[PDB]
Design an enzyme around this catalytic site. Structure first.
Site, PDB file in Angstrom:
ATOM      1  N   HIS A  40       0.729  -1.227   0.013  1.00  0.00           N
ATOM      2  CA  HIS A  40       0.055   0.157  -0.040  1.00  0.00           C
ATOM      3  C   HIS A  40       0.844   0.963   0.059  1.00  0.00           C
ATOM      4  CE1 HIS A  40       0.374   0.155   4.554  1.00  0.00           C
ATOM      5  NE2 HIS A  40       0.358   1.545   4.284  1.00  0.00           N
ATOM      6  N   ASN A  54      17.462  12.421  11.138  1.00  0.00           N
ATOM      7  CA  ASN A  54      16.682  13.592  11.135  1.00  0.00           C
ATOM      8  C   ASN A  54      16.267  13.576   9.559  1.00  0.00           C
ATOM      9  OD1 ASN A  54      15.338  16.388  10.477  1.00  0.00           O
ATOM     10  ND2 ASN A  54      16.014  16.554  12.793  1.00  0.00           N
ATOM     11  N   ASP A  84       0.174  -7.380   1.876  1.00  0.00           N
ATOM     12  CA  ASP A  84       0.671  -6.096   2.015  1.00  0.00           C
ATOM     13  C   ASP A  84       2.281  -6.221   1.948  1.00  0.00           C
ATOM     14  OD1 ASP A  84       0.730  -3.347   1.653  1.00  0.00           O
ATOM     15  OD2 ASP A  84      -0.089  -3.258   3.745  1.00  0.00           O
ATOM     16  N   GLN A 174       0.094   6.053  11.173  1.00  0.00           N
ATOM     17  CA  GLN A 174       0.185   6.614   9.870  1.00  0.00           C
ATOM     18  C   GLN A 174       1.469   7.275   9.554  1.00  0.00           C
ATOM     19  OE1 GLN A 174      -2.888   6.761  10.886  1.00  0.00           O
ATOM     20  NE2 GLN A 174      -3.896   5.631   9.040  1.00  0.00           N
ATOM     21  N   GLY A 175       2.406   6.878   8.366  1.00  0.00           N
ATOM     22  CA  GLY A 175       3.543   7.132   7.976  1.00  0.00           C
ATOM     23  C   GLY A 175       4.773   6.488   8.724  1.00  0.00           C
TER      24      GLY A 175
END
Ligand SMILES: O[C@@H]1[C@@H](O)[C@@H](O)OC[C@H]1O
Ligand SMILES: O[C@@H]1[C@@H](O)[C@H](O)OC[C@H]1O
Ligand SMILES: [Ca+2]
Length: 223
Positions: A40, A54, A84, A174-175
């Site tokens: 996905h 970072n 997935d 999320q992410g």
């Protein structure tokens, strides 16, 4: 990652950031030229970023390498998120060292109760939005399949497992999608989906990598 801790620069050396102008998914380096992620997360024009802490500052251990080929699992179902998983070939081999390294594929599936390390640059709040710039880490146990199936009736296939805390407060989010779940030094899961983040009785659901080892090895040997 909700409820985690700051990993520390380059302490998770197989962690990659997938970038299309901005970080949008994590992944895992499994050898010098291949990355594993979630299907996905698929899109065209991916740059793979290695050796990141970072993601908004060039700190000096980064390797930025474009993808040459993406291979979504042949049976990926985007409605159920079954299968997935996807593979990404780098245009050139990464330079491997102590701060950029591959993670081993498993030889067996991990059992409920095993503690795992989940990492990523995703959202850190369960009600709200705040994306960190440095990599976040979470230690979480694999849950029994009966607790997993009871949390998500009718939705968990044999290619999925749950990991986390039924009481909530600690989860991927999320992410973090596409990133690693590492248990005893082996890649056992891929951050896949869940209902919300860190909600009571709604643990994270992960792609069960041990079911895919033959497909990965065969695909890599031929591409
Ligand atoms: O997660 C669920 C998925 O398994 C499918 O059934 O579509 C509806 C979603 O709620
Ligand atoms: O592989 C280890 C994992 O099992 C544990 O949960 O966190 C530390 C890692 O080194
Ligand atoms: Ca950086």
């Amino acid at each position: 990652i909700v409820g985690g801790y700051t990993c520390g620069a380059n302490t998770v050396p197989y962690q990659v950031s997938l970038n299309s102008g901005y970080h949008f998914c994590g992944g895992s380096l499994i050898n010098s030229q291949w990355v594993v992620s979630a299907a996905h997360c698929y899109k065209s024009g991916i740059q793979v970023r290695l050796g990141e802490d970072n993601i908004n500052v060039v700190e000096g251990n980064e390797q930025f390498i474009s993808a040459s080929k993406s291979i979504v699992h042949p049976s990926y179902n985007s409605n159920t998120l079954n299968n997935d998983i996807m593979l990404i070939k780098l245009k050139s081999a990464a330079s491997l060292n102590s701060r950029v390294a591959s993670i081993s594929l498993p030889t067996s599936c991990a059992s409920a109760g095993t503690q795992c390390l989940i990492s990523g640059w995703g959202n850190t709040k369960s009600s709200g939005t705040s994306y960190p710039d440095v990599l976040k880490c979470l230690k979480a146990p694999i849950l029994s399949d009966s607790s997993c199936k009871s949390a998500y009736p009718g939705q968990i296939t044999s290619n999925m497992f749950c990991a986390g805390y039924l009481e909530g407060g600690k989860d991927s989010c999320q992410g973090d999608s596409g990133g690693p779940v590492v248990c005893s030094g082996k890649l056992q899961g891929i951050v896949s989906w869940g209902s919300g983040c860190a909600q009571k009785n709604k643990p994270g659901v992960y792609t069960k990598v041990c079911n895919y080892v033959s497909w990965i090895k065969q695909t890599i040997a031929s591409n």
